[PDB]
Amino acid sequence: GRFVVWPSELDSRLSRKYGRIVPRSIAVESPRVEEIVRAAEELKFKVIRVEEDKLNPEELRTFGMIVLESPYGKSKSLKLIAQKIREFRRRSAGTLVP
């Protein structure tokens, strides 16, 4: 259905109390809004709206939200998005370790 994606929800750097929803091993480090949008697009989700606000200032320096429509539930959608981002980054780096 339609739901919002907040980068913290799939960020492996974070604890669950602080917002991570996705299992630790599936989550990716510092998911960027642009990465989430591209992942959603590759998964053929419909991107409704993207908001990104960067303000000169700590943890509130960056704000980002993506409104998506997916054929799947939010939890499954988030897992697929996280996996797609990992795949993206690996493709670009072309290497496993630094």
Author numbering: 2 to 58, 65 to 105
Sentences from the paper on this structure:
In all living cells the signal recognition particle (SRP) recognizes nascent polypeptides destined for secretion or membrane insertion as they emerge from translating ribosomes. As SRP binds to signal sequences emerging from the ribosomes, the resulting complex composed of the SRP and the ribosome-nascent chain complex is then targeted towards the membrane through the GTP-dependent interaction with the membrane-associated SRP receptor (SR also named FtsY in bacteria). We describe the X-ray structures of SRP54 and SRP19 the two protein constituting the proteinaceous core of the SRP from the hyperthermophilic archaeon Pyrococcus furiosus. SRP54 and SRP19 constitute the conserved core in all archaeal and eukaryotic SRPs.
We solved two distinct crystal forms of Pfu-SRP19. Two molecules of SRP19 associate in a dimer with an extended β-sheet surface built around the anti-parallel association of their respective β2 strands. Observation of the crystal packing in the orthorhombic subunit reveals a tetrameric arrangement between symmetry-related molecules that is similar to the one observed in the monoclinic form. Pfu-SRP19 is characterized by a more extended β-sheet due to longer β2 and β3 strands when compared with all other available SRP19 structures. The structure is also characterized by two loops (L1 and L2). The loop L1, the primary RNA-binding surface is rigid and well defined in density whereas the loop L2 is disordered and absent in our final models. Superposition of our free SRP19 structure on the RNA-bound SRP19 structures reveals that the difference between free SRP19 and the RNA-bound forms lies exclusively in the conformation of the L2 loop region. The disordered L2 region of the “free” protein has a well-defined conformation in the RNA bound structures. In contrast the L1 loop remains structurally unchanged, this is observed even when all available structures of free and RNA-bound SRP19 from different species are compared. Through an induced fit mechanism involving the rearrangement of its disordered L2 loop, SRP19 assists proper folding of the SRP RNA and therefore favors subsequent binding of SRP54.
